[PDB]
Amino acid sequence: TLRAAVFDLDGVLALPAVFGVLGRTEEALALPRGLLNDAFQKGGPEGATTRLMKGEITLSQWIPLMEENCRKCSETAKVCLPKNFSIKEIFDKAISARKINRPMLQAALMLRKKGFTTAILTNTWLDDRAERDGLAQLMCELKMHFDFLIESCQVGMVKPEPQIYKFLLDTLKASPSEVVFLDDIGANLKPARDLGMVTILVQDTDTALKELEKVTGIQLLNTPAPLPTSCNPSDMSHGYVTVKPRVRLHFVELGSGPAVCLCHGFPESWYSWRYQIPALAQAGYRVLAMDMKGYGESSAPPEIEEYCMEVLCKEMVTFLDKLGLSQAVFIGHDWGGMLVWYMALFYPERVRAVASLNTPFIPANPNMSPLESIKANPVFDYQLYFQEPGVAEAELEQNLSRTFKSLFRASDESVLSMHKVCEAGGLFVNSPEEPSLSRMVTEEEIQFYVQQFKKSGFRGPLNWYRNMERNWKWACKSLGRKILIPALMVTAEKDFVLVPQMSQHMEDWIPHLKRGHIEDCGHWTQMDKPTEVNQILIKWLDSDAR
Amino acid sequence: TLRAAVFDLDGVLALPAVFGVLGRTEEALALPRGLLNDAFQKGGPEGATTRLMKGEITLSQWIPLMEENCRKCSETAKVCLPKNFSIKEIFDKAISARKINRPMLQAALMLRKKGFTTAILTNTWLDDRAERDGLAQLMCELKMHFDFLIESCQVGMVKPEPQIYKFLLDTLKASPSEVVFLDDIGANLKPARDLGMVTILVQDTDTALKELEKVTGIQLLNTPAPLPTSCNPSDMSHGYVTVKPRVRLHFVELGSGPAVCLCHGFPESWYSWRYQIPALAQAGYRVLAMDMKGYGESSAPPEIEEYCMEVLCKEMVTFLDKLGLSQAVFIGHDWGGMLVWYMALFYPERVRAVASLNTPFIPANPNMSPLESIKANPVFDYQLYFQEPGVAEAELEQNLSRTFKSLFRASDESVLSMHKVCEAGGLFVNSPEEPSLSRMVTEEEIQFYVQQFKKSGFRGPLNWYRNMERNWKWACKSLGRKILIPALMVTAEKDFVLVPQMSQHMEDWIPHLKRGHIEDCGHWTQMDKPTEVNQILIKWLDSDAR
Numbered sequence A, B: 001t002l003r004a005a006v007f008d009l010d011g012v013l014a015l016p017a018v019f020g021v022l023g024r025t026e027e028a029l030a031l032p033r034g035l036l037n038d039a040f041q042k043g044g045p046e047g048a049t050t051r052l053m054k055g056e057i058t059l060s061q062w063i064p065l066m067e068e069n070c071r072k073c074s075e076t077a078k079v080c081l082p083k084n085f086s087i088k089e090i091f092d093k094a095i096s097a098r099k100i101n102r103p104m105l106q107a108a109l110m111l112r113k114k115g116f117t118t119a120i121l122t123n124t125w126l127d128d129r130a131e132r133d134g135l136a137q138l139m140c141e142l143k144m145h146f147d148f149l150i151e152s153c154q155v156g157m158v159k160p161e162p163q164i165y166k167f168l169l170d171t172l173k174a175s176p177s178e179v180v181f182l183d184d185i186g187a188n189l190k191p192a193r194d195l196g197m198v199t200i201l202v203q204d205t206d207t208a209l210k211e212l213e214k215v216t217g218i219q220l221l222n223t224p225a226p227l228p229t230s231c232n233p234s235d236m237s238h239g240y241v242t243v244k245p246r247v248r249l250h251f252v253e254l255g256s257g258p259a260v261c262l263c264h265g266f267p268e269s270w271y272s273w274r275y276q277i278p279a280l281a282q283a284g285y286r287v288l289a290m291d292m293k294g295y296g297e298s299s300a301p302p303e304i305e306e307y308c309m310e311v312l313c314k315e316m317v318t319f320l321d322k323l324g325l326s327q328a329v330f331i332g333h334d335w336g337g338m339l340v341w342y343m344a345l346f347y348p349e350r351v352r353a354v355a356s357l358n359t360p361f362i363p364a365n366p367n368m369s370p371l372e373s374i375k376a377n378p379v380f381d382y383q384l385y386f387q388e389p390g391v392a393e394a395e396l397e398q399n400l401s402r403t404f405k406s407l408f409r410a411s412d413e414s415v416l417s418m419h420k421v422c423e424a425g426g427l428f429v430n431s432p433e434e435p436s437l438s439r440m441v442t443e444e445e446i447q448f449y450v451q452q453f454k455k456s457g458f459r460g461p462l463n464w465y466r467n468m469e470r471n472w473k474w475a476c477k478s479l480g481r482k483i484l485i486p487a488l489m490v491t492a493e494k495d496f497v498l499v500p501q502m503s504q505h506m507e508d509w510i511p512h513l514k515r516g517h518i519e520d521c522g523h524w525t526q527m528d529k530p531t532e533v534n535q536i537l538i539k540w541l542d543s544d545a546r
């Protein structure tokens, strides 16, 4: 029956309520109880506040009216306002004090997730103060999680006027009985109730959520910790840079602040960072999540040498040039991890800081052919399997769904051993035709990859592995250097190929290296442990790249 | 005969030379003359400096070696280094002191422009100091103006070694006699001379330029002030954001720093900002230059109401949302100018600051139909001509080259009077079939527009003018507000439609409005007076949006 949930901003989705700083200021300043609310409300439907909430005047135009109102109320109550009494001041402080009320957001999220239409309906103002960006950030962070945002100052109406609930219903395309509406002010609930909506009077969040859980029959309280926000590909800004005649690179771009360039591994996609993109943008960074050469909407030339680290790096430098970026932070995973280390070593002036997930920095051994280094570790056998052009292409391209469903698995779910892959004749010789879905991925997500890999297949991706000798030789040039810019190595306990201990000597080459470590996490780090990854990158970004 | 010009960075394209801070420090500190150069050069082809210039070690690895060298030299010369003597310090200061030597750059530019291949060949280092971004910015700013940049620490060779000149020649695809090479160190010139290249020993810039002028037979000295850097469209980052199902917006994106959204007028293009894009990126801003709805690579739905200011504004807000931008500075021209004022008035929380070129802010007159306001001013007659769907489309689309060549003209070149356009039956009824090129535009540039307008024609663009009543009504809602965020109005003396005096009352609505004014400039402001526009926007950005 109930099919839509409507939340207010002040006192419901965001706390402490700004209305409530009137009360607190009165106490703090020993003013007559209610004096400030009286001034805030003076003239009712015709006073300054209502004009403000209706969008007739801006906040800065309103501030002096409220001032005058406060003086009127203090005269009539035969008291004085303190020296330095400042409405601008009180409101600047209250508006920045207000934060998202996380449990209310997650309940709205869960309801949206079980099929509800969700809306914010709020009495709010046109904000033109010096410090307005603060409110603009909050609204941006909230509005994305809801179907609609209805703001009194944009529609020219205000709660409790009946017309705005009529507008609400009309916006929702629902009848009154299908809607639950939550508000911290009872007077605002009343016209929703008149129409026969379920209403919830929000005092403490937990009680309100109990009421909401009861009435919708969905669990909202005591729910497991949810995944971070993901990315819907068709809501992203898609960017395209031609770095040379036959090579253009695609990336997705979110946020502002220092530039953070995300570099995925084999055989993945920008979308491999879908959990980190909003989190890092939210944390104050300009995230550029690439399709690396060979992938997705980037160019995929056929020749092997187009994919040697030297050419790949120079292309990433050009990509910075053409975007007008003097540096970026480079964060990589798997092959992307390898590339960012080399960016640190050959272009430190372009790298604000470097981090790798799973991929350790190992210097070339000048006395040992790289092919032999690889034959030393049985778990790298899959890399020899990738050498002969066509062989791996045929297996990986035969059945795309099957490929990604077999590869993208958590530590406890794996179906393919990297063990004697050449000998067995292939990577999937002993895995199902129809693999079960890993807990890490949905069917929709697997299909995104499938669709990406239909444009170019696996020749470009595989070529990344086909320049061992060439990379070795270019790497030998850097054996005298150290990496001395800010640097983070994140090891993944259950990555049975890029094992943690493979990173154990890195400090000899990177003396001030910082570490994070993630337990119970396999090779597909970002999707396996997205919360831990986000926490480790943001903490490291905030302290080292800023 | 001469077909290529090769410039060094230190002492030639950039001044003061860092080599020269060794000399100055010696004097400042009363050290033995040459003591620091001796330490810098110690061990010659096998000392630390050469290893550095070859890319064997990074700058920060080198710093302690130079330190040790300085101590060695002071011992042997039986002197003391002062307390607090610091190579890190001396080099941090010298490297930031160094700036582009503008007259050398403009000569390289002019030579490139007359057909030369141009290169930078420099002995330089891998820079990993905390303050490396400074050097990275310089190199970015220089490297874009040349065909090649050859850096000793990337190719593993150094001037004066013969092999690097061989590499140079090979990179240029020219023989030695076709090349002029300039350097401030004679020893570096010598192997170029051995090969039969023209060399110039650069001491003062002006004398070097005289030599270069003589030997190439091109004027380099005393040349008129050149246009600002323009944009080559296929070197830009192209961005695409879907703001709703049938509407995607395209923009070009350059630089980092605060977000600056450029909004063009009718009937133009992102490319209408080609002169401002590099200048504003260079000044430390993240420039997003749009194709506005209706244009270029943005969507162009046919319905008139898709182009009313309300819908246009809401779409620009969504565009910020999807890019994760809480605000941007909005700068508009002509119709774009109108749109940014309305962004200021309905979304001040999203606008860091607002500026308009030519378009004044005029409030709706609540007592006068907007069609009548327009019939009041004979110079707006062209706007009535634009009302009837199809009529203007047919004339403007008949011959695209002719259209843009007729419209894009400087104040003294105009062929079309906005005077009684309806009566004459059209905007071009009394202009040539083949108009001459305006001084403001090349044939190539006109063709870019032509090509842009072949995708959607003029229906979308013209629809911007077809919502007078609808815009009037939405504008009436804002008649109580003022614009109180940072705001700049730039008037164009010879814009005979958007005349300066049309802005004369703006201060009543925008009390702290700032102004710039440009003389001898018609309607096509950005291309007419690109230097003045750049100077006025950057000065206003730096003081009001930062």
Ligand SMILES: O=C(O)Cn1cc(Br)c(C2CC2)n1
Pocket (backbone or CB within 6 Å): A266, A334, A382, A407, A494, A495, A496, A497, A498, A522, A523, A524
């Ligand atoms: O290591 C694992 O957990 C599973 N795995 C599958 C592949 Br392909 C790899 C290579 C590191 C890229 N690892």
Ligand SMILES: O=C(O)Cn1cc(Br)c(C2CC2)n1
Pocket (backbone or CB within 6 Å): B266, B334, B382, B407, B494, B495, B496, B497, B498, B522, B523, B524
């Ligand atoms: O005013 C001028 O200088 C020439 N001109 C041509 C046109 Br269409 C216009 C309208 C302001 C857009 N002006």
Ligand SMILES: [Mg+2]
Pocket (backbone or CB within 6 Å): A008, A009, A010, A011, A012, A183, A184, A185
């Ligand atoms: Mg409330």
Ligand SMILES: [Mg+2]
Pocket (backbone or CB within 6 Å): B008, B009, B010, B011, B012, B183, B184, B185
């Ligand atoms: Mg020099």
